[PDB]
Amino acid sequence: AIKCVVVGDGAVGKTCLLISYTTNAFPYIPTVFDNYSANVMVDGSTTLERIEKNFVITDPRLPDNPIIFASDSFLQLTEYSREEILGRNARFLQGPETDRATVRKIRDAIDNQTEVTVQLINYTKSGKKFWNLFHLQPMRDQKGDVQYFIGVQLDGTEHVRDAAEREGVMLIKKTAENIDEAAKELGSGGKPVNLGLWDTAGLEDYDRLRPLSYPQTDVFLICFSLVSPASFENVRAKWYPEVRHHCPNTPIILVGTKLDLRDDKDTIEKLKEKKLTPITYPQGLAMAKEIGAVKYLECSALTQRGLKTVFDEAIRAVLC
């Protein structure tokens, strides 16, 4: 259950983006307060990415058994970027002092599709030497055929022995099972996440009752209108200081609404008569970086363009 509070000036599209996202419709009635709760399915569009351990996943059905997934932790350890290793066999980690007889035991485990737990010397991208308490585990489908391979690494400085060895093997095995369950859950479509949408009033008259819905907030949506420079300036002048006055460390996502009007003839003409111009993307991006927003997203409640990405990043900011 995630609570999401949407704040911003009057008539910028706060209520419309909530209704269009929950009921696929489109309404002007100044909202005092309204609740909205919709079930969102997190399908990586995950719990597998939240696992902060050194592990990778490969595909034995593809030539040379390439890496199809690599954790953030694995990237920080091996000093490799994702694009550099995604799709390549994990043998690049090996080097001169790497015991080849141990590598053979790994090869036999993959060929026979079994589990294996070994210790070997691997190398980072810059050539940093470290011991690897490595555990390999095949991931079978519902039929019983091996679909993937899980490789869990426990980096160290020396070759662990006795109790230290027994402790480490225990950890990487328990870790592998967690990954295995996280992978199966991903294929099933993950778990449904209840999203609480709290619509607030933008009028100045409701400035006193508005912070009453701020407690227990997991993520804020500060909205402004792309065709209203006044609402854009209010983000720095009003909405950001107000949110931070009650919620000092709550994830804020800046949202530019009414995207379909930025490329509208009559709309731009209306703004030119008042000597104004629609808010541009770098302008909106500079505002998000200034107020420390985790993401800047533009959307249209009317055409639903970028509308789903807004609430997807809202959830992602909470789960990550």
Ligand X SMILES: Nc1nc2c(ncn2[C@@H]2O[C@H](COP(=O)(O)OP(=O)(O)OP(=O)(O)O)[C@@H](O)[C@H]2O)c(=O)[nH]1
Task: By CB under 6 A, tell whether 80 contacts ligand FMN.
Answer: no
Judged by beta carbon distances under 5 to 8 A according to partner kind, the member of ligand FMN, ligand X, Ca ion, none in contact with residue 228 is none
Q: Site mask, Ca ion, residues 144-163, x = CB under 5 A?
A: -x------------------
Site residues for ligand FMN, 130-169, by CB under 6 A, read: 132, 134, 136, 149-151, 153
H-helix segments, 239-299: 240-246, 265-272, 281-290
Q: Does position 240 bind ligand FMN by CB under 6 A?
A: no
Structure tokens at 98: 């790497």
CA distances from 21 to 133, 192, 256, 267, 309 (A): 47, 16, 15, 24, 11
Residues in contact with 131: Cβ distance below 8 Å, sequence separation at least 6, in sequence order: 119, 120, 121, 122, 155, 156, 157, 158, 159, 160
# chain residues binding ligand FMN, by CB under 6 A: 21
Told to check if 224 binds ligand FMN by CB under 6 A, we report no
Contacts of 184 (CB under 8 A, 6+ apart): none
Nearest 5 degrees, angle CA 280-CA 283-CA 288? 125
260 lines the binding site for ligand X (CB under 6 A) = yes
Which CB, 49 or 260, lies closer to ligand X?
Answer: 260
Binding residue for Mg ion (CB under 5 A) from 3, 15, 78, 284?
A: 15
String marking each residue 62-91 x if it binds Mg ion according to CB under 5 A = ------------------------------
Taking CB under 6 A as the rule, does residue 58 contact ligand FMN? yes
Which range in 17-25, 108-116, 204-212, 291-299 contacts Ca ion by CB under 5 A? 204-212
Which structure tokens are listed for 76? Answer: 């920080």
Q: Rounded to an integer, what distance in angstroms lies between the CA atom of residue 29 and that of residue 202?
A: 12
Phi first, then psi, for residue 60 (nearest 5°) are -70, -15
Site for Ca ion in 5-44 (CB under 5 A): none
Considering beta carbons, is residue 15 or 228 the nearer one to Mg ion? 15
Stretch touching Mg ion by CB under 5 A, among 1-9, 23-31, 130-138, 162-170: 23-31
Among 31, 46, 117, 132, contact with ligand X (rule: CB under 6 A): 31
15 binds, among ligand FMN, Ca ion, Mg ion, none (CB under 5 to 8 A by kind): Mg ion
Partner residues linked to 133 by β-bridges: 119, 154
Tokens of 132: 């690897």
Q: Is residue 271 at the binding interface for ligand X, with CB under 6 A as the rule?
A: no
- Tally the C-alpha atoms within 13 A of residue 202's C-alpha that lie toward its C-beta: 21
Cα separation, 58 vs 64, whole angstroms: 10
The nearer residue to Ca ion, 59 or 185, going by C-beta atoms, is: 59
Give the binding site for Ca ion (CB under 5 A). 145, 205
